[PDB]
Design a protein around this ligand. Sequence first.
Ligand SMILES: [Mg+2]
Ligand SMILES: [Mg+2]
Ligand SMILES: [Mg+2]
Ligand SMILES: [Mg+2]
Ligand SMILES: [Mg+2]
Ligand SMILES: [Mg+2]
Ligand SMILES: [Mg+2]
Ligand SMILES: [Mg+2]
Ligand SMILES: [Mg+2]
Ligand SMILES: [Mg+2]
Ligand SMILES: [Mg+2]
Ligand SMILES: [Mg+2]
Ligand SMILES: [Mg+2]
Ligand SMILES: [Mg+2]
Ligand SMILES: [Mg+2]
Ligand SMILES: [Mg+2]
Ligand SMILES: [Mg+2]
Ligand SMILES: [Mg+2]
Ligand SMILES: [Mg+2]
Ligand SMILES: [Mg+2]
Ligand SMILES: [Mg+2]
Ligand SMILES: [Mg+2]
Ligand SMILES: [Mg+2]
Ligand SMILES: [Mg+2]
Ligand SMILES: [Mg+2]
Ligand SMILES: [Mg+2]
Ligand SMILES: [Mg+2]
Ligand SMILES: [Mg+2]
Ligand SMILES: [Zn+2]
Ligand SMILES: [Zn+2]
Lengths: 114, 91, 248, 60, 69, 50
Amino acid sequence: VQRLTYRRRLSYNTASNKTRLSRTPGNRIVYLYTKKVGKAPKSACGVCPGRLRGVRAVRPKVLMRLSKTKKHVSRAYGGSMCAKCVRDRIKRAFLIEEQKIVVKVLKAQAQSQK
Amino acid sequence: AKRTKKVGIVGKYGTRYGASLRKMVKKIEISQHAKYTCSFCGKTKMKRRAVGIWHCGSCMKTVAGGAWTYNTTSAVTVKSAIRRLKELKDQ
Amino acid sequence: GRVIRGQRKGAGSVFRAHVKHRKGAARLRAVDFAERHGYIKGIVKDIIHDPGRGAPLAKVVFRDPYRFKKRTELFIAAEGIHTGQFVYCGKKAQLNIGNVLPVGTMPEGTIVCCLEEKPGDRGKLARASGNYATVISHNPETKKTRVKLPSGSKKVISSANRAVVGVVAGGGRIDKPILKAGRAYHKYKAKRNCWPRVRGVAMNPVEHPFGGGNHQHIGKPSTIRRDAPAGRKVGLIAARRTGRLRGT
Amino acid sequence: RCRKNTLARRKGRHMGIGKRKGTANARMPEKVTWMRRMRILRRLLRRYRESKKIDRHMYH
Amino acid sequence: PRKIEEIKDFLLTARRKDAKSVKIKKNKDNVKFKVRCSRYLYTLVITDKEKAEKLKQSLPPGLAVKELK
Amino acid sequence: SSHKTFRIKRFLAKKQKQNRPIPQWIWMKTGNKIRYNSKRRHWRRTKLGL
RNA sequence: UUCCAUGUGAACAGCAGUUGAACAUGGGUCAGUCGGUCCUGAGAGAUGGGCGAGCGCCGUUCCGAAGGGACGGGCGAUGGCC
RNA sequence: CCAGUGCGGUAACGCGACCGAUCCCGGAGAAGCCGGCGGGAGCCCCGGGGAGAGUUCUCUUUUCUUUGUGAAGGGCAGGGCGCCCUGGAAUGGGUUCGCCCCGAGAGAGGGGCCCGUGCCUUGGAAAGCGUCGCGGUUCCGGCGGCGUCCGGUGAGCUCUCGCUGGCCCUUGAAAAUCCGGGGGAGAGGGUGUAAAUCUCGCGCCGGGCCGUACCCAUAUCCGCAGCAGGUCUCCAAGGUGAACAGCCUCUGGCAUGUUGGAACAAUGUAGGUAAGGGAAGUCGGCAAGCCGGAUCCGUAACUUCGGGAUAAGGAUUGGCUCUAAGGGCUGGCAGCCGACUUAGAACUGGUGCGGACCAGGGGAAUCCGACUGUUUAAUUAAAACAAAGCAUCGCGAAGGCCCGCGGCG
Ligand SMILES: [Mg+2]
Ligand SMILES: [Mg+2]
Ligand SMILES: [Mg+2]
Ligand SMILES: [Mg+2]
Ligand SMILES: [Mg+2]
Ligand SMILES: [Mg+2]
Ligand SMILES: [Mg+2]
Ligand SMILES: [Mg+2]
Ligand SMILES: [Mg+2]
Ligand SMILES: [Mg+2]
Ligand SMILES: [Mg+2]
Ligand SMILES: [Mg+2]
Ligand SMILES: [Mg+2]
Ligand SMILES: [Mg+2]
Ligand SMILES: [Mg+2]
Ligand SMILES: [Mg+2]
Ligand SMILES: [Mg+2]
Ligand SMILES: [Mg+2]
Ligand SMILES: [Mg+2]
Ligand SMILES: [Mg+2]
Ligand SMILES: [Mg+2]
Ligand SMILES: [Mg+2]
Ligand SMILES: [Mg+2]
Ligand SMILES: [Mg+2]
Ligand SMILES: [Mg+2]
Ligand SMILES: [Mg+2]
Ligand SMILES: [Mg+2]
Ligand SMILES: [Mg+2]
Ligand SMILES: [Zn+2]
Ligand SMILES: [Zn+2]
């Protein structure tokens, strides 16, 4: 069984020095030093624990080289906040201001009472 | 099956620490590892995240409470006293 | 003889507090117009665990009232607070749990924590895990207020300083026995280097004034004066009475 | 030689109480027996549920 | 390396200025035309042999053509 | 150490160029008192400082 | 420099050697992609300041006029089919 | 004349681009330890095909070696979702090895996204490797034929991905760096040979400085030395076996550790064996010895009810020939496959059978210390120290304790 060796001078089992195995076209098992597992973006809600959908999950300095559509989703607040909390904020930002209209109407008719 | 007679959650500590100390730890380990009902949705999923930090698994809502129980008797006493003082001030 | 352990704690070499993973200083927000005349609203964003602190912290976001920016801060979480709760604060913030309003307005018998000692210094009194301070009475002229602190002692306070209404979360912490030396180790490692206290008769008489002797005995009386020089001021510093407290 | 011995281990030889050194829970553990029996039985019950052999309530 | 499916795209690739050479690999079952552009190696994989020899007639003349084995 | 810095490697370069012996056309000079290189250095025995 | 080759056998290799990590001549380490370099960590450290007879020391945001940057617009010149 | 800062889907979201500044919000950077299970490879295993070798006194369709595809794209299996749509569930269902999920929408249909390290493909057969054979008598990345194939398994070992739970009076790093969004200040052209602007596809130019040999340890390091000492990591095959135990072996490595020869005396040092008695030896069972694995039974006092406990005490164990039970897949039945086990029975040997290795002596009591931990590196591992527990004492900050020659330290 062909035991094998590192190919850099870092000889410790660190987080940056982690590998996978591969079989080269000259029938030989060789390490390949893998890039770490990038995480998809988390929403700006603070509530939902699932990470966002439709956005690439890459190690973050790659995001220079990806195009715009690969990094957002085609919605208002998209690519930075989940859909459930977008529609919750739409309903909330509507209903608060409708209650504010109701409050100004009630206080204006209480002044008309006076 | 009932696997013990007296020790419950504190049969894990073996023959150690004293009968009175293991019996006194038992109530508190039960109380901090139980899952309490959330008052915000009703699901029985308040787990102790950290010491004084209860957290609902389903609301994703975190309640600062007691160190071993969701709320303390001094806390609910203080809450009733504060709402009584508020209604006596505000009439 | 040598320089004893209690003397060496004041040099700050290994006895500094282990404050890397701590979350920040837990302070009330700074006194401005919006808190001196009205009230400002901000929501609790989350509740975090400060290592070395038995009380949980409430990260609360207010809206900055002079430029479009959002301030975030850390409070002592009053017991019963939660996320998504609108904490109000100011002179006209109304009285319920989580708010922080000045002491001269809340009535007598209220239960406040993270209390502010001298007016403006962001909350010093009554801020350990589960511990409160009550408002006893007021004095409208000269604007001071007696406050019963958690030591059982009472203090006259200028009536313009803030206080979080309610007991501190994390209450009732000490009643569970730390069972084992591992729990004590992991407690005091996140606090600071103090835990394996070698008692003084186990030492040699060079580095503690009790050591030596062919019996582990103190020798000299353990109760000693306050004008003892350092390196002697060991054991029962100026005991008024000294025994088991039977009676009050 | 190894393969000629493992043929006899298939046939049941060399497996008596003399040629045994581990606990039975170490040789073939009872958690593994349990979980193999349950991936047998729960797949049997969902075959019989989906093939209309038993209904929802008898299944449960 | 880039594979080109249709034959018109390969002709447009081969007539590009960056193309230094094309090389024709004739194995069994298959014929591969590999053009060396300035960033990729574009391969056209075709299995019709009379269409292969027609395409070899249809290469542009100035490009360096090399048939491989 | 295969991770040398430039100053360390430069110092070692000077010491291994100094480690060469006497050139044999010297001991025929007129005012000579030299018979070998006394300041030599074997890499097991003397460890050079650093 | 012990690496590698050619040679030697005085000294060394606690015996011996035709051998050697010994001696003498010669070669040998090639990078955008592998590291350093960059970042902060526990920490270290000038400036303001304070102390100190004094070399200097404490201090690290505290008793500081602590930025040399920029969208745009106006001014005056330059080089280019102004 | 007027419009023209793109389009599609109910939606999750998609399409190859798809203007935009000071300002604000967020994400990645950025997280502990442990348990359980699942997916993927690497290796191992089994059944066949090739090619070459090994045995052949007899047997052996035998035994050994080898039997390949990189990075980066394109497609697809494969996992995962705390994503969307229809609809409304009790006779409660769904489901895991354990959990767990639901009128805050479960099952059931149909979609969407992420990772796709695996397969096919481009690279890629040209090259590599194995065989047979020609050339250059040389100086050859020389030239040729052939081949590099088809299946199965698994609580297997290592790595990695993912889900899920447990523990904490322990909550398990920062910053550079990069991106998305909210905003809408502005800019673009007047219908064209359009313009501003484009994070789409190509095309052009460049990436300086320093390190790179080798040893890595019973001979390249430090111990004055080629010193039995010490020195942080990575890879890890077959058998027996529970095993990374011990023992034997294959790839690889070495020459017995600063010498050889000849004898086999005393004293040793290190292994062993001993009749009969069994601690009578000696301060003392010191050293040795007994026991020892597994399966089936059986297990007392005492006790903090957790233990004690492998208590103690028995029996069984080999080889061989069998029987029975424990699964998938496809079309209560039939067919076809693939695993390790467990229980029992017979026969059988000079009663030997955990046959080597591995591998607890047992009990009744006293004293001390609760325990786990630490301790005098080089005469003391203990009853000492520490510990949780219990009780005191000081201190509400111009404060308690302490440092400092000094200071709004
Ligand atoms: Mg591959
Ligand atoms: Mg997209
Ligand atoms: Mg000092
Ligand atoms: Mg300590
Ligand atoms: Mg002592
Ligand atoms: Mg003294
Ligand atoms: Mg079980
Ligand atoms: Mg040395
Ligand atoms: Mg010699
Ligand atoms: Mg050599
Ligand atoms: Mg290159
Ligand atoms: Mg300094
Ligand atoms: Mg569903
Ligand atoms: Mg070939
Ligand atoms: Mg916008
Ligand atoms: Mg090297
Ligand atoms: Mg020997
Ligand atoms: Mg020898
Ligand atoms: Mg040696
Ligand atoms: Mg005898
Ligand atoms: Mg005998
Ligand atoms: Mg005698
Ligand atoms: Mg005797
Ligand atoms: Mg002994
Ligand atoms: Mg016993
Ligand atoms: Mg007694
Ligand atoms: Mg002890
Ligand atoms: Mg000692
Ligand atoms: Zn959300
Ligand atoms: Zn809830």
